[PDB]
Every structure is written in C-alpha cells, then in structure tokens.
Amino acid sequence: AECSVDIQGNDQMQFNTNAITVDKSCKQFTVNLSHPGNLPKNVMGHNWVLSTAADMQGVVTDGMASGLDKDYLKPDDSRVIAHTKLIGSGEKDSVTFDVSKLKEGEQYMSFCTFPGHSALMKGTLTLK
Ligand SMILES: [Cu+2]
C-alpha cells in the first residue's frame, strides 16, 4: 500500500513478492515481515536486508560468517541500509527507514542473508 509493505518468507524459501516499489512521497518506509509454515529459525530463518545491487554479494558472504546469533549479518555493516531480525515460524518483525537514503540512479536489492537462502530469496526495489 502507500509507505508500507508486508512480506512473508515461507518454508519452501520463497518471499511472497520479489519486487517492491517505494513511493518517493513517503518520508519513511516500513517493511513488515512474517513467517508462515512451521520450521524454526536455526534451520529456516528469514530476515529482509537492503543494500545496493552491487553490495549484496559482499553482505551475503560476510553475513554467513557472522553466524546465527548475529542473525547472519555483520554488526554495523556499512553497506546495509535497513534490515529486520532473523525470524522463525510464527515470528514477526518490522523495520522503518528514511526514504532519503535511496538515491535515484542506483539499483537496490532486498534479500534474505541466511546461508543458502539468498539465491532464491532476492528481489529488486524501485523508487518512484
Ligand atoms: Cu531466508
């Protein structure tokens, strides 16, 4: 809807959508993430992480190194613009960020950094 999107991550490692549009009239933007299915976080947890299309693989690779307790994200990782926490089934998390942080003329991506997930759990973000 305007200024908020509700996205699901399930047990076949699918995100409900894989392209999000972010209206520029919005001052902040909120992502609400939930997890259907019944599998726990240590084997099937999902987060929602944002970076440039170009920064993604680095973020995914160093996130894997940080481990589960760090929610597979390197602390104070300067390339992430916003991210949720890693959640298991029945869990929910939300993240709001300033839309001013998204520059026009750049390509951004949303992905699940949990190891092995990112290949399927990835999508584009358009600022319009
Ligand atoms: Cu995932």
CSV table of N, CA, C and O and ligand atoms in Angstrom, one decimal:
chain,number,residue,atom,x,y,z
A,1,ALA,N,0.9,-1.1,0.0
A,1,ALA,CA,0.0,0.0,0.0
A,1,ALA,C,1.0,1.2,0.0
A,1,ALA,O,2.1,1.0,-0.3
A,2,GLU,N,0.5,2.4,0.3
A,2,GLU,CA,1.4,3.5,0.3
A,2,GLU,C,2.3,3.4,1.6
A,2,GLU,O,1.8,2.9,2.6
A,3,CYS,N,3.6,3.6,1.4
A,3,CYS,CA,4.5,3.6,2.5
A,3,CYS,C,4.7,2.4,3.4
A,3,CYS,O,5.5,2.5,4.4
A,4,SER,N,4.2,1.2,3.1
A,4,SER,CA,4.4,0.0,4.0
A,4,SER,C,4.1,-1.2,3.1
A,4,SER,O,3.3,-1.1,2.2
A,5,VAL,N,4.9,-2.2,3.3
A,5,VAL,CA,4.7,-3.5,2.5
A,5,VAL,C,4.8,-4.6,3.6
A,5,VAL,O,5.5,-4.5,4.6
A,6,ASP,N,4.0,-5.6,3.4
A,6,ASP,CA,4.0,-6.7,4.3
A,6,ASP,C,4.5,-7.9,3.5
A,6,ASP,O,3.9,-8.2,2.5
A,7,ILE,N,5.6,-8.5,3.9
A,7,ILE,CA,6.2,-9.5,3.1
A,7,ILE,C,6.4,-10.8,4.0
A,7,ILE,O,6.6,-10.7,5.2
A,8,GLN,N,6.2,-11.9,3.4
A,8,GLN,CA,6.2,-13.2,4.0
A,8,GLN,C,7.4,-14.0,3.5
A,8,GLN,O,7.8,-13.8,2.4
A,9,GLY,N,8.0,-14.9,4.4
A,9,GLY,CA,9.0,-15.8,3.9
A,9,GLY,C,8.6,-17.1,4.4
A,9,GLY,O,8.3,-17.3,5.6
A,10,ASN,N,8.5,-18.1,3.6
A,10,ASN,CA,7.9,-19.4,4.0
A,10,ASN,C,8.8,-20.6,4.1
A,10,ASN,O,10.0,-20.5,3.9
A,11,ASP,N,8.4,-21.8,4.2
A,11,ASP,CA,9.3,-23.0,4.3
A,11,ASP,C,9.7,-23.6,3.0
A,11,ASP,O,10.5,-24.6,3.0
A,12,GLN,N,9.3,-23.1,1.8
A,12,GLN,CA,9.9,-23.5,0.5
A,12,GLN,C,10.9,-22.5,0.1
A,12,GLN,O,11.3,-22.5,-1.1
A,13,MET,N,11.4,-21.6,1.0
A,13,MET,CA,12.2,-20.4,0.8
A,13,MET,C,11.9,-19.6,-0.4
A,13,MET,O,12.6,-19.3,-1.3
A,14,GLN,N,10.6,-19.0,-0.2
A,14,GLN,CA,10.0,-18.1,-1.1
A,14,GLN,C,9.7,-16.9,-0.2
A,14,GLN,O,9.3,-17.0,0.9
A,15,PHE,N,9.8,-15.7,-0.8
A,15,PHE,CA,9.3,-14.4,-0.3
A,15,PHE,C,8.0,-14.3,-1.1
A,15,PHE,O,7.9,-14.7,-2.2
A,16,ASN,N,6.9,-13.7,-0.5
A,16,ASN,CA,5.6,-13.6,-1.2
A,16,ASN,C,5.7,-12.7,-2.4
A,16,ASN,O,5.0,-13.0,-3.4
A,17,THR,N,6.6,-11.7,-2.5
A,17,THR,CA,6.8,-10.9,-3.7
A,17,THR,C,8.4,-10.8,-3.8
A,17,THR,O,9.1,-10.9,-2.8
A,18,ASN,N,8.8,-10.4,-5.0
A,18,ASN,CA,10.2,-10.2,-5.2
A,18,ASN,C,10.5,-9.0,-6.1
A,18,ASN,O,11.3,-9.0,-7.0
A,19,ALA,N,9.8,-7.9,-5.7
A,19,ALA,CA,9.9,-6.6,-6.4
A,19,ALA,C,9.1,-5.7,-5.5
A,19,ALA,O,8.0,-6.0,-5.2
A,20,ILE,N,9.7,-4.7,-4.9
A,20,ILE,CA,9.0,-3.8,-4.1
A,20,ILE,C,9.1,-2.4,-4.7
A,20,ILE,O,10.2,-2.0,-5.2
A,21,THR,N,8.0,-1.6,-4.8
A,21,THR,CA,8.1,-0.2,-5.2
A,21,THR,C,8.0,0.7,-4.0
A,21,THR,O,7.3,0.4,-3.0
A,22,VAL,N,8.8,1.8,-3.9
A,22,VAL,CA,8.9,2.7,-2.8
A,22,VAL,C,8.6,4.0,-3.4
A,22,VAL,O,9.3,4.5,-4.3
A,23,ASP,N,7.4,4.6,-2.9
A,23,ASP,CA,7.0,5.9,-3.4
A,23,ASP,C,7.9,6.9,-2.7
A,23,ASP,O,8.1,6.9,-1.5
A,24,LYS,N,8.3,7.9,-3.5
A,24,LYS,CA,9.2,9.0,-3.0
A,24,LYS,C,8.4,10.1,-2.2
A,24,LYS,O,9.1,10.9,-1.6
A,25,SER,N,7.1,10.1,-2.2
A,25,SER,CA,6.3,11.0,-1.4
A,25,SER,C,6.5,10.6,0.1
A,25,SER,O,6.3,11.4,1.0
A,26,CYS,N,6.8,9.3,0.3
A,26,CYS,CA,7.0,8.7,1.6
A,26,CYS,C,8.2,9.3,2.3
A,26,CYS,O,9.3,9.5,1.7
A,27,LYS,N,8.1,9.7,3.6
A,27,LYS,CA,9.3,10.2,4.3
A,27,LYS,C,10.0,9.0,4.9
A,27,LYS,O,11.2,8.9,4.9
A,28,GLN,N,9.3,8.0,5.5
A,28,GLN,CA,9.9,6.8,5.8
A,28,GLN,C,9.1,5.6,5.2
A,28,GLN,O,8.0,5.8,4.6
A,29,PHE,N,9.7,4.4,5.2
A,29,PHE,CA,9.1,3.3,4.6
A,29,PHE,C,9.2,2.1,5.6
A,29,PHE,O,10.2,2.0,6.2
A,30,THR,N,8.1,1.3,5.7
A,30,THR,CA,8.1,0.2,6.7
A,30,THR,C,7.8,-1.1,6.0
A,30,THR,O,6.9,-1.3,5.1
A,31,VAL,N,8.7,-2.1,6.3
A,31,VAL,CA,8.6,-3.4,5.8
A,31,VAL,C,8.1,-4.3,7.0
A,31,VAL,O,8.7,-4.1,8.1
A,32,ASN,N,7.1,-5.1,6.9
A,32,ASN,CA,6.7,-5.9,8.0
A,32,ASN,C,6.9,-7.3,7.5
A,32,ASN,O,6.3,-7.6,6.4
A,33,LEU,N,7.6,-8.1,8.2
A,33,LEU,CA,8.0,-9.5,7.7
A,33,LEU,C,7.3,-10.5,8.7
A,33,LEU,O,7.4,-10.3,9.9
A,34,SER,N,6.8,-11.5,8.1
A,34,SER,CA,6.2,-12.6,9.0
A,34,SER,C,6.7,-13.9,8.4
A,34,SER,O,7.2,-13.9,7.3
A,35,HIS,N,6.5,-15.1,9.0
A,35,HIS,CA,7.0,-16.4,8.5
A,35,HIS,C,5.9,-17.4,8.6
A,35,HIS,O,5.7,-18.0,9.7
A,36,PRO,N,5.1,-17.7,7.6
A,36,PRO,CA,4.4,-19.0,7.5
A,36,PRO,C,5.2,-20.3,7.4
A,36,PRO,O,6.3,-20.3,7.0
A,37,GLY,N,4.4,-21.3,7.8
A,37,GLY,CA,5.0,-22.6,7.8
A,37,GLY,C,5.2,-23.0,9.3
A,37,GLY,O,4.5,-22.4,10.2
A,38,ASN,N,6.0,-23.9,9.6
A,38,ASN,CA,6.2,-24.4,10.9
A,38,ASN,C,7.7,-24.7,11.2
A,38,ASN,O,8.0,-25.2,12.3
A,39,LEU,N,8.6,-24.3,10.3
A,39,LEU,CA,10.0,-24.6,10.6
A,39,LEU,C,10.7,-23.5,11.4
A,39,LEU,O,10.5,-22.3,11.2
A,40,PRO,N,11.5,-23.9,12.5
A,40,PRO,CA,12.4,-23.0,13.2
A,40,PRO,C,13.5,-22.2,12.5
A,40,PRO,O,13.9,-22.6,11.4
A,41,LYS,N,13.9,-21.1,13.2
A,41,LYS,CA,14.9,-20.2,12.7
A,41,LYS,C,16.3,-20.7,12.5
A,41,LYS,O,17.0,-20.2,11.6
A,42,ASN,N,16.8,-21.6,13.2
A,42,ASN,CA,18.2,-22.1,13.1
A,42,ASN,C,18.4,-23.0,11.9
A,42,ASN,O,19.5,-23.3,11.4
A,43,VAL,N,17.2,-23.5,11.3
A,43,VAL,CA,17.3,-24.2,10.1
A,43,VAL,C,16.5,-23.5,8.9
A,43,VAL,O,16.9,-23.7,7.8
A,44,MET,N,15.6,-22.6,9.2
A,44,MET,CA,14.8,-21.9,8.1
A,44,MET,C,14.4,-20.5,8.5
A,44,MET,O,13.4,-19.9,8.1
A,45,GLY,N,15.3,-19.7,9.1
A,45,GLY,CA,15.0,-18.3,9.5
A,45,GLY,C,15.2,-17.4,8.3
A,45,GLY,O,16.1,-17.5,7.5
A,46,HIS,N,14.4,-16.3,8.3
A,46,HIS,CA,14.5,-15.3,7.2
A,46,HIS,C,14.6,-13.9,7.8
A,46,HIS,O,14.2,-13.7,8.9
A,47,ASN,N,15.3,-13.1,7.2
A,47,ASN,CA,15.4,-11.7,7.5
A,47,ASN,C,15.1,-11.0,6.2
A,47,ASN,O,14.9,-11.6,5.2
A,48,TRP,N,15.1,-9.6,6.2
A,48,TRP,CA,14.9,-8.8,5.0
A,48,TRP,C,16.0,-7.8,5.1
A,48,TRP,O,16.0,-7.1,6.1
A,49,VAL,N,16.9,-7.7,4.2
A,49,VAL,CA,18.1,-6.9,4.2
A,49,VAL,C,18.1,-6.0,2.9
A,49,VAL,O,17.8,-6.6,1.9
A,50,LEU,N,18.5,-4.8,3.0
A,50,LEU,CA,18.6,-3.9,1.9
A,50,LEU,C,20.0,-3.4,1.6
A,50,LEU,O,20.6,-2.9,2.5
A,51,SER,N,20.5,-3.4,0.3
A,51,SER,CA,21.7,-2.7,0.0
A,51,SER,C,21.7,-2.4,-1.5
A,51,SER,O,20.6,-2.5,-2.1
A,52,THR,N,22.8,-1.9,-2.1
A,52,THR,CA,22.8,-1.6,-3.5
A,52,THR,C,22.9,-3.0,-4.1
A,52,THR,O,23.5,-4.0,-3.6
A,53,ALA,N,22.5,-3.1,-5.4
A,53,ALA,CA,22.6,-4.3,-6.2
A,53,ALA,C,24.0,-4.8,-6.2
A,53,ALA,O,24.3,-6.0,-6.0
A,54,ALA,N,25.0,-3.8,-6.3
A,54,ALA,CA,26.4,-4.1,-6.3
A,54,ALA,C,27.0,-4.5,-4.9
A,54,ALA,O,28.0,-5.2,-4.9
A,55,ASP,N,26.3,-4.2,-3.8
A,55,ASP,CA,26.9,-4.5,-2.5
A,55,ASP,C,26.4,-5.8,-2.0
A,55,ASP,O,27.1,-6.5,-1.1
A,56,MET,N,25.3,-6.3,-2.4
A,56,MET,CA,24.6,-7.5,-2.0
A,56,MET,C,25.5,-8.8,-1.7
A,56,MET,O,25.4,-9.4,-0.6
A,57,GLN,N,26.3,-9.2,-2.7
A,57,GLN,CA,27.0,-10.4,-2.5
A,57,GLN,C,28.0,-10.3,-1.4
A,57,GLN,O,28.3,-11.3,-0.6
A,58,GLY,N,28.7,-9.2,-1.2
A,58,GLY,CA,29.6,-9.0,-0.1
A,58,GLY,C,28.9,-9.1,1.2
A,58,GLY,O,29.3,-9.9,2.1
A,59,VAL,N,27.7,-8.5,1.3
A,59,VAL,CA,26.9,-8.5,2.5
A,59,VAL,C,26.4,-9.9,2.9
A,59,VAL,O,26.5,-10.3,4.0
A,60,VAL,N,26.0,-10.7,1.9
A,60,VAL,CA,25.6,-12.1,2.0
A,60,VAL,C,26.7,-12.9,2.5
A,60,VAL,O,26.6,-13.8,3.4
A,61,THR,N,27.9,-12.8,1.9
A,61,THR,CA,29.1,-13.5,2.2
A,61,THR,C,29.6,-13.2,3.6
A,61,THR,O,29.9,-14.1,4.4
A,62,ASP,N,29.7,-12.0,4.0
A,62,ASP,CA,30.1,-11.7,5.4
A,62,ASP,C,29.1,-11.9,6.5
A,62,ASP,O,29.4,-12.2,7.6
A,63,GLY,N,27.8,-11.9,6.1
A,63,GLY,CA,26.7,-12.2,6.9
A,63,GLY,C,26.7,-13.7,7.4
A,63,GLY,O,26.6,-14.1,8.5
A,64,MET,N,27.0,-14.6,6.4
A,64,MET,CA,27.2,-16.0,6.6
A,64,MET,C,28.3,-16.3,7.6
A,64,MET,O,28.2,-17.2,8.4
A,65,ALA,N,29.3,-15.5,7.6
A,65,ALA,CA,30.4,-15.6,8.5
A,65,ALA,C,30.1,-15.2,10.0
A,65,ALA,O,30.7,-15.8,10.9
A,66,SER,N,29.2,-14.3,10.2
A,66,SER,CA,28.8,-13.8,11.5
A,66,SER,C,28.0,-14.8,12.4
A,66,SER,O,28.0,-14.7,13.6
A,67,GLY,N,27.3,-15.7,11.7
A,67,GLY,CA,26.6,-16.8,12.4
A,67,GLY,C,25.2,-16.3,12.8
A,67,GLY,O,24.8,-15.2,12.7
A,68,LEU,N,24.5,-17.4,13.3
A,68,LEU,CA,23.1,-17.2,13.7
A,68,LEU,C,22.8,-16.3,14.8
A,68,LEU,O,21.8,-15.5,14.7
A,69,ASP,N,23.6,-16.2,15.9
A,69,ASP,CA,23.4,-15.3,17.0
A,69,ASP,C,23.5,-13.8,16.5
A,69,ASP,O,22.8,-13.0,17.1
A,70,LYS,N,24.3,-13.6,15.5
A,70,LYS,CA,24.3,-12.2,14.9
A,70,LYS,C,23.3,-12.0,13.8
A,70,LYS,O,23.4,-11.1,13.1
A,71,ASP,N,22.3,-13.0,13.7
A,71,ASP,CA,21.3,-13.0,12.7
A,71,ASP,C,21.8,-13.0,11.2
A,71,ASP,O,21.2,-12.5,10.3
A,72,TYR,N,23.0,-13.6,11.1
A,72,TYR,CA,23.8,-13.7,9.9
A,72,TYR,C,23.9,-12.4,9.1
A,72,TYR,O,23.8,-12.2,7.9
A,73,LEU,N,24.3,-11.4,9.9
A,73,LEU,CA,24.6,-10.0,9.4
A,73,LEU,C,25.8,-9.6,10.2
A,73,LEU,O,25.8,-9.7,11.5
A,74,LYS,N,26.8,-9.0,9.5
A,74,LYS,CA,28.0,-8.5,10.2
A,74,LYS,C,27.5,-7.2,10.9
A,74,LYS,O,26.8,-6.4,10.3
A,75,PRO,N,27.7,-7.0,12.3
A,75,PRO,CA,27.4,-5.8,13.0
A,75,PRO,C,27.9,-4.6,12.4
A,75,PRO,O,29.0,-4.6,11.8
A,76,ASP,N,27.1,-3.5,12.4
A,76,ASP,CA,27.5,-2.2,11.9
A,76,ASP,C,28.0,-2.2,10.4
A,76,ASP,O,28.7,-1.3,10.0
A,77,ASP,N,27.6,-3.2,9.7
A,77,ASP,CA,27.9,-3.4,8.3
A,77,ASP,C,27.5,-2.1,7.5
A,77,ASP,O,26.3,-2.0,7.1
A,78,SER,N,28.4,-1.3,7.1
A,78,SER,CA,28.1,0.0,6.4
A,78,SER,C,27.4,-0.1,5.1
A,78,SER,O,26.9,0.9,4.6
A,79,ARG,N,27.3,-1.3,4.5
A,79,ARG,CA,26.6,-1.5,3.2
A,79,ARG,C,25.1,-1.8,3.4
A,79,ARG,O,24.4,-1.7,2.4
A,80,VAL,N,24.6,-2.1,4.6
A,80,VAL,CA,23.2,-2.4,4.8
A,80,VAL,C,22.5,-1.0,5.0
A,80,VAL,O,23.0,-0.2,5.8
A,81,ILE,N,21.4,-0.7,4.4
A,81,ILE,CA,20.6,0.5,4.6
A,81,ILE,C,19.5,0.2,5.6
A,81,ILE,O,19.1,1.1,6.3
A,82,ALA,N,19.0,-1.0,5.7
A,82,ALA,CA,17.9,-1.4,6.6
A,82,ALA,C,17.8,-2.9,6.6
A,82,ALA,O,18.2,-3.5,5.6
A,83,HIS,N,17.4,-3.5,7.7
A,83,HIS,CA,17.2,-4.9,7.8
A,83,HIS,C,16.3,-5.3,9.0
A,83,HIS,O,16.3,-4.5,10.0
A,84,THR,N,15.6,-6.4,8.9
A,84,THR,CA,14.8,-6.9,10.0
A,84,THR,C,15.8,-7.8,10.9
A,84,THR,O,16.9,-8.0,10.6
A,85,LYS,N,15.2,-8.4,11.9
A,85,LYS,CA,15.9,-9.5,12.6
A,85,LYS,C,15.6,-10.8,12.0
A,85,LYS,O,14.7,-10.9,11.1
A,86,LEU,N,16.3,-11.9,12.3
A,86,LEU,CA,16.0,-13.2,11.6
A,86,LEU,C,14.9,-13.8,12.4
A,86,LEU,O,14.9,-13.8,13.6
A,87,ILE,N,13.8,-14.3,11.7
A,87,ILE,CA,12.7,-14.9,12.4
A,87,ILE,C,12.4,-16.3,12.0
A,87,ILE,O,12.7,-16.7,10.9
A,88,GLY,N,11.8,-17.1,12.9
A,88,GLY,CA,11.3,-18.4,12.7
A,88,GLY,C,9.8,-18.4,12.5
A,88,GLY,O,9.3,-17.4,12.4
A,89,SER,N,9.2,-19.6,12.4
A,89,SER,CA,7.8,-19.6,12.1
A,89,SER,C,7.0,-19.1,13.2
A,89,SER,O,7.4,-19.2,14.3
A,90,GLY,N,5.9,-18.4,12.8
A,90,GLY,CA,5.1,-17.6,13.7
A,90,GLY,C,5.7,-16.3,14.2
A,90,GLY,O,5.1,-15.5,14.9
A,91,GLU,N,7.0,-16.0,13.9
A,91,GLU,CA,7.5,-14.8,14.4
A,91,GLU,C,7.3,-13.7,13.3
A,91,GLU,O,6.9,-14.0,12.2
A,92,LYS,N,7.5,-12.5,13.8
A,92,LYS,CA,7.1,-11.2,13.0
A,92,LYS,C,8.2,-10.2,13.4
A,92,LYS,O,8.7,-10.1,14.5
A,93,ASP,N,8.6,-9.3,12.5
A,93,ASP,CA,9.5,-8.2,12.8
A,93,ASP,C,9.1,-7.1,11.8
A,93,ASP,O,8.6,-7.5,10.7
A,94,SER,N,9.5,-5.9,12.0
A,94,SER,CA,9.1,-4.7,11.1
A,94,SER,C,10.3,-3.8,11.1
A,94,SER,O,11.1,-3.7,12.1
A,95,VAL,N,10.6,-3.1,10.0
A,95,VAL,CA,11.7,-2.1,10.0
A,95,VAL,C,11.3,-0.8,9.2
A,95,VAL,O,10.8,-0.9,8.1
A,96,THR,N,11.5,0.4,9.8
A,96,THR,CA,11.1,1.6,9.1
A,96,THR,C,12.4,2.4,8.8
A,96,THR,O,13.3,2.4,9.6
A,97,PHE,N,12.6,3.0,7.6
A,97,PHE,CA,13.9,3.7,7.3
A,97,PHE,C,13.6,5.0,6.5
A,97,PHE,O,12.5,5.1,6.0
A,98,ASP,N,14.5,5.9,6.5
A,98,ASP,CA,14.3,7.2,5.8
A,98,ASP,C,14.5,6.9,4.3
A,98,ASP,O,15.5,6.5,3.8
A,99,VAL,N,13.5,7.3,3.5
A,99,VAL,CA,13.5,7.2,2.0
A,99,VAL,C,14.5,8.0,1.4
A,99,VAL,O,15.1,7.8,0.3
A,100,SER,N,15.0,9.1,2.1
A,100,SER,CA,16.0,10.0,1.6
A,100,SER,C,17.4,9.3,1.4
A,100,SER,O,18.2,9.7,0.7
A,101,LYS,N,17.5,8.1,2.1
A,101,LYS,CA,18.7,7.3,1.9
A,101,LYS,C,18.7,6.6,0.6
A,101,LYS,O,19.7,6.0,0.3
A,102,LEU,N,17.7,6.7,-0.2
A,102,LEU,CA,17.7,6.0,-1.5
A,102,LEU,C,17.9,7.0,-2.6
A,102,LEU,O,17.1,8.0,-2.8
A,103,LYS,N,19.1,7.0,-3.2
A,103,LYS,CA,19.5,7.8,-4.3
A,103,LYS,C,18.9,7.3,-5.6
A,103,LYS,O,18.8,6.1,-5.9
A,104,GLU,N,18.4,8.2,-6.5
A,104,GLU,CA,17.9,7.9,-7.8
A,104,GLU,C,19.2,7.7,-8.6
A,104,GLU,O,20.2,8.4,-8.4
A,105,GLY,N,19.1,6.8,-9.6
A,105,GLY,CA,20.3,6.5,-10.4
A,105,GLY,C,21.1,5.4,-9.8
A,105,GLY,O,22.3,5.2,-10.1
A,106,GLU,N,20.5,4.6,-8.9
A,106,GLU,CA,21.1,3.5,-8.2
A,106,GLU,C,20.1,2.3,-8.2
A,106,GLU,O,18.9,2.5,-8.2
A,107,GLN,N,20.7,1.1,-8.2
A,107,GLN,CA,19.9,-0.1,-8.2
A,107,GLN,C,19.9,-0.8,-6.9
A,107,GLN,O,21.0,-1.0,-6.5
A,108,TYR,N,18.8,-1.0,-6.2
A,108,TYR,CA,18.9,-1.6,-4.9
A,108,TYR,C,18.2,-3.0,-4.9
A,108,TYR,O,17.5,-3.3,-5.9
A,109,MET,N,18.6,-3.8,-3.9
A,109,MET,CA,18.1,-5.1,-3.7
A,109,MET,C,17.8,-5.5,-2.3
A,109,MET,O,18.4,-5.0,-1.3
A,110,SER,N,16.8,-6.3,-2.2
A,110,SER,CA,16.3,-6.9,-0.9
A,110,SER,C,16.5,-8.4,-1.0
A,110,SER,O,16.2,-9.0,-2.0
A,111,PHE,N,17.1,-9.0,0.1
A,111,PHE,CA,17.4,-10.4,0.1
A,111,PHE,C,17.4,-10.9,1.5
A,111,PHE,O,17.4,-10.1,2.4
A,112,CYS,N,17.4,-12.3,1.6
A,112,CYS,CA,17.5,-13.0,2.9
A,112,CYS,C,18.9,-13.4,3.0
A,112,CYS,O,19.3,-14.3,2.3
A,113,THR,N,19.7,-12.9,3.9
A,113,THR,CA,21.1,-13.3,4.0
A,113,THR,C,21.4,-14.7,4.6
A,113,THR,O,22.5,-15.2,4.5
A,114,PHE,N,20.4,-15.4,5.3
A,114,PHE,CA,20.6,-16.7,5.8
A,114,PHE,C,21.2,-17.7,4.8
A,114,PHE,O,20.6,-17.8,3.7
A,115,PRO,N,22.2,-18.5,5.2
A,115,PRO,CA,23.0,-19.2,4.2
A,115,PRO,C,22.2,-20.1,3.4
A,115,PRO,O,21.5,-21.0,3.9
A,116,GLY,N,22.3,-19.9,2.1
A,116,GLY,CA,21.7,-20.7,1.1
A,116,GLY,C,20.4,-20.1,0.6
A,116,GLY,O,19.9,-20.4,-0.5
A,117,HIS,N,19.9,-19.1,1.3
A,117,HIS,CA,18.5,-18.6,1.0
A,117,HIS,C,18.5,-17.5,-0.1
A,117,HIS,O,17.6,-17.6,-0.9
A,118,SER,N,19.5,-16.7,0.0
A,118,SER,CA,19.7,-15.5,-0.9
A,118,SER,C,19.6,-15.7,-2.4
A,118,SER,O,19.2,-14.8,-3.2
A,119,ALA,N,19.9,-16.9,-2.9
A,119,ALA,CA,19.8,-17.3,-4.3
A,119,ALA,C,18.3,-17.2,-4.7
A,119,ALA,O,18.0,-16.8,-5.8
A,120,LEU,N,17.4,-17.7,-3.9
A,120,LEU,CA,16.0,-17.6,-4.3
A,120,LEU,C,15.4,-16.4,-3.6
A,120,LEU,O,14.5,-15.7,-4.2
A,121,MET,N,15.8,-16.1,-2.4
A,121,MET,CA,15.2,-15.0,-1.7
A,121,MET,C,15.9,-13.7,-2.0
A,121,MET,O,16.6,-13.1,-1.1
A,122,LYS,N,15.6,-13.2,-3.1
A,122,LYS,CA,16.1,-11.9,-3.6
A,122,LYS,C,15.1,-11.1,-4.5
A,122,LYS,O,14.3,-11.7,-5.2
A,123,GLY,N,15.2,-9.8,-4.5
A,123,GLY,CA,14.3,-9.0,-5.3
A,123,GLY,C,14.8,-7.6,-5.5
A,123,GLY,O,15.7,-7.2,-4.9
A,124,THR,N,14.2,-6.9,-6.5
A,124,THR,CA,14.5,-5.5,-6.8
A,124,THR,C,13.7,-4.5,-6.0
A,124,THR,O,12.7,-4.8,-5.5
A,125,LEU,N,14.2,-3.2,-6.0
A,125,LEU,CA,13.4,-2.2,-5.3
A,125,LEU,C,13.4,-1.0,-6.2
A,125,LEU,O,14.4,-0.6,-6.6
A,126,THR,N,12.2,-0.5,-6.5
A,126,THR,CA,12.1,0.7,-7.4
A,126,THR,C,11.6,1.9,-6.6
A,126,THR,O,10.6,1.7,-5.8
A,127,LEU,N,12.3,3.0,-6.7
A,127,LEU,CA,12.0,4.3,-6.0
A,127,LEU,C,11.3,5.0,-7.1
A,127,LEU,O,11.9,5.2,-8.2
A,128,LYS,N,10.0,5.4,-6.9
A,128,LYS,CA,9.3,6.1,-8.0
A,128,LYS,C,8.5,7.3,-7.4
A,128,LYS,O,8.0,7.2,-6.2
B,1,CU,CU,15.7,-17.0,4.3
